[PDB]
Amino acid sequence: QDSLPDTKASGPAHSKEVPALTAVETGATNPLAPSDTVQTRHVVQRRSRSESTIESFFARGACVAIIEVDNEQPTTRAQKLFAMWRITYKDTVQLRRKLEFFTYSRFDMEFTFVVTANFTNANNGHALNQVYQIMYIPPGAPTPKSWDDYTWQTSSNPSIFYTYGAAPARISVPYVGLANAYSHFYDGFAKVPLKTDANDQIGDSLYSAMTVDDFGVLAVRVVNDHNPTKVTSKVRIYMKPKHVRVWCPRPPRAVPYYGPGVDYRNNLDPLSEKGLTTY
Amino acid sequence: ISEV
Amino acid sequence: ISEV
Amino acid sequence: ACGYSDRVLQLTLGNSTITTQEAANSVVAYGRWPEFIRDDEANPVDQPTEPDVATCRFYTLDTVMWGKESKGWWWKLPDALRDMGLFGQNMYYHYLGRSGYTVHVQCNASKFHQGALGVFAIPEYCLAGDSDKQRYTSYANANPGERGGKFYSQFNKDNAVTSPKREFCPVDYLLGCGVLLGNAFVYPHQIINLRTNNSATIVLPYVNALAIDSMVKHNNWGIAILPLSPLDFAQDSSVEIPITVTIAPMCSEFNGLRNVTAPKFQ
Amino acid sequence: ACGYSDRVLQLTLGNSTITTQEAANSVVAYGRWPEFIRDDEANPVDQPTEPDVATCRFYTLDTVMWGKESKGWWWKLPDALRDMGLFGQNMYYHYLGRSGYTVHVQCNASKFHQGALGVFAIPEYCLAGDSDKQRYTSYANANPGERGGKFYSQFNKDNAVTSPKREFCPVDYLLGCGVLLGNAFVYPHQIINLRTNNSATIVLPYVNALAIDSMVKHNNWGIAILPLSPLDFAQDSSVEIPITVTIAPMCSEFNGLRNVTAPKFQ
Amino acid sequence: LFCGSMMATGKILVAYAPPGAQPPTSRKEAMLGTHVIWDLGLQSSCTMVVPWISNVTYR
Amino acid sequence: GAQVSSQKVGAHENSSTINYTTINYYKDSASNAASKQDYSQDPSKFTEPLKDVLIKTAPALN
Amino acid sequence: GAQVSSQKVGAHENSSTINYTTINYYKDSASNAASKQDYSQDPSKFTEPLKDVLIKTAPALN
Ligand SMILES: CCOC(=O)c1ccc(OCCC2CCN(c3ccc(C)nn3)CC2)cc1
Ligand SMILES: *C(=O)CCCCCCCCCCCCC
Ligand SMILES: *C(=O)CCCCCCCCCCCCC
């Protein structure tokens, strides 16, 4: 049973108990109910808070990235034959705001990949079905310079081999934090400037940033050799936190995000105009 | 099995 | 079954 | 019995005692009293230093004056205390240090004065900056020590790309961090309403995602004091009363001793 | 059993470890291991500070060079350690402080070198002065800190009445104090005889007529190192080997905390 | 490991300073942190343990 | 190793406790679905962080 | 013929031993997945291949 407290039949009052009065200076919120300030009937409560549990609130796959990758003839200039994405929930705003209702979090992460593709050019013949390779490159491991170089051999890095048309790719990731909890906010620095330093750049750092590569990257490529005609593709990444726990509540972001930290720039006017005595 |  |  | 009260307190730590004849009970942040790192939550293996009464005592910071134009004040912890006697020494001679705190904020006036101070204790108080540049506020400007910082009424952007101030720009109604001030009450707080109380007493545990961390690289708590209701007196338009912040470390323990850290605050 | 020895020691205090493969057992001064002030011998009533591993560890002082002309070296305790990390800070921030110590003196050479160092630990080591003037040695000159002082072979009196040096004149065979050196063995001691041992280890209790006193006004122990037999090697007339003194505070406790003492060593 | 001749003697300070301060340039500064004073003799070699002292649970 | 539990029935068909079965296929617990049987707690640490928590009918400031 | 064992739970949901079930479908054991419940051993054969293994506090060479 998970229903909320029943309402009590409460009656008339003439006493020296004054629950309606309090003092919010103390830091506390008055634990009042209708039966303290008005006559109430007995209501048997069936309503429950089941959808607002920390798990139910986050239990939904959110889009956090769109990785664009092409399969075309390797020419001699800047191309997208392979792509890399620093894993994060911050490129998007929606999940970012929900997780940021809290300072600390601990959870397992589910990743679901929706791959879509299309023809770029009106017509150079067609393409046989493409297989995609998503490789996780943890910090330290060699990053690919070429779409078919040796790093894609993937002997120890986790890789997904997705086939176009198949049900969207899906995997789970454990709680991989270097600490007892993921910090959604870090009031600090990774380096400190010492008086004895040679230049003042040695000890300089980005405020609120911790590790440089934080969790690593996802590298994406079409394993297929190029067709005559080009195929452009998009790997959409959906993120869902499961087996979730959260600490220290924070106010929701009220102005538009300006980068990874708490920085604001514009649209600092969130509230509407409404008259004091207007309903 | 395990029945709760 | 076999439960360890 | 005898005649005891919610408004009359005595705080005694080490060789220091505070008395208040007009308090508003006291807040224990998140319901947790400060404590030492337990063996089953321990991580550095070296025997810690616990200076007890020589570091866990009441340090009074430089007084600030509240006046009709005052927009707000903010401090970071442990930063506010980096130069406070043997605490600061222990903090800079060791790589690792944890601490809880008792914050006691002081503001008295008269039955004829008026105004309400919002005293806020915030975990990980990340503030917004100067510029177009993201996460660019310098260590020196992020950490004012005892002097603390101030809030502003609007976002005046640091315009000079050539020689940037690399400072914070904390806008009051956005709590200096992109959210609205009215919701700061989800954080551990008290209100100094001048008709009700001279002071606020918030006790703080060590809050962090680690059992212990670098106190020199990282602030755990931020203290924000924003006037929810402006100072007013009789009809004298330039009224001015002192706000004094007194802080004490609690259950302080240190790990990883070596030579002293000398940061560049220049 | 296994193969243990009187000459092979390991001293471990805090984050510091000393190993010696050629020691001469170890002396515990007057048979008393260092200890804390007992409640029935207590006198200041305020709760003491006990910094444990952060102050009770091995501080190595600047090395001195022993050579054919070397007459002797001397240090005072706690003075030698006044600037040693968190110990010095605790010493200057409190009116009262007591401490025991482990003194470890280091001098190695070769089976072909020769000489004998007399390592002496003396309670209340009062030295003689410069002048015609009695008890005129200045605080600044009485206390060399880490640098220590030296002995001389004869009494050369500071002659200039107009601008007096106000220094000590410690004559070696008079132990710098009016008595004969051969009798200094009634004091806690060891001998570094180069054919026998690299080092000497004297453990020291707090000795005083009070349970605790001002460490800044008063030295409890003096360390005197006089060559009983001169350094000699092969036939090279200007031989020279290093003598390194490493000291650790023990059972350190402090009373009467207030603002830091800044002495004038100028 | 001292690979010198048996007639050679010496005493060496070897140290570890946990992060956050100036990297040691002098024995005086190195003294202050975790350390072993090695004395050369029949036991040819000396072990210094660098103890896990860290803020994060994994580096 | 099958796990069996009661569904919280909302709209009841014209036919009482109805159950559902769950089995974990993977060794790593991160691979598991969400159990969603989540217990709750008091607002208190947040709604009343007070050292002397007082009764709602007595004066807040005494 | 079902095999049942305890998962080592890392991040615990707000809901204790959780199990997983395994069944082999093939006769040839090579066809099987990896059990991954692997026991360990001493470094000793490598870190101390000595005929007279000595105690760390006693002189290495006596
Ligand atoms: C510090 C703020 O950021 C976070 O809190 C936060 C951000 C991202 C998080 O995701 C976990 C990190 C990685 C670890 C592994 N990973 C993988 C692993 C394998 C594959 C095929 N694909 N992705 C991708 C995600 C977890 C937490
Ligand atoms: C406990 O689970 C024993 C009962 C198992 C009943 C048969 C289950 C058939 C499916 C087995 C799943 C194996 C997954 C790796
Ligand atoms: C032991 O395994 C007996 C219990 C079997 C439960 C039903 C399993 C259904 C799947 C059978 C798999 C056959 C594979 C060749």
Swiss-Prot record, chain A:
It is found in: Virion; Host cytoplasm. Interacts with capsid protein VP0, and capsid protein VP3 to form heterotrimeric protomers. Interacts with human PVR. Five protomers subsequently associate to form pentamers which serve as building blocks for the capsid. Interacts with capsid protein VP2, capsid protein VP3 and capsid protein VP4 following cleavage of capsid protein VP0. Forms an icosahedral capsid of pseudo T=3 symmetry with capsid proteins VP2 and VP3. The capsid is 300 Angstroms in diameter, composed of 60 copies of each capsid protein and enclosing the viral positive strand RNA genome. Capsid protein VP1 mainly forms the vertices of the capsid. Capsid protein VP1 interacts with host cell receptor PVR to provide virion attachment to target host cells. This is Capsid protein VP1. The chain holds residues 600 to 878 of 2206 of the full protein.
Swiss-Prot record, chains G, H:
Myristoylation is required during RNA encapsidation and formation of the mature virus particle. Disulfide bonds: none annotated. It is found in: Virion. A lipid is attached at residue 1 (N-myristoyl glycine). Lies on the inner surface of the capsid shell. After binding to the host receptor, the capsid undergoes conformational changes. Capsid protein VP4 is released, Capsid protein VP1 N-terminus is externalized, and together, they shape a pore in the host membrane through which the viral genome is translocated into the host cell cytoplasm. Interacts with capsid protein VP1 and capsid protein VP3. This is Capsid protein VP4. The chain holds residues 2 to 69 of 2206 of the full protein.
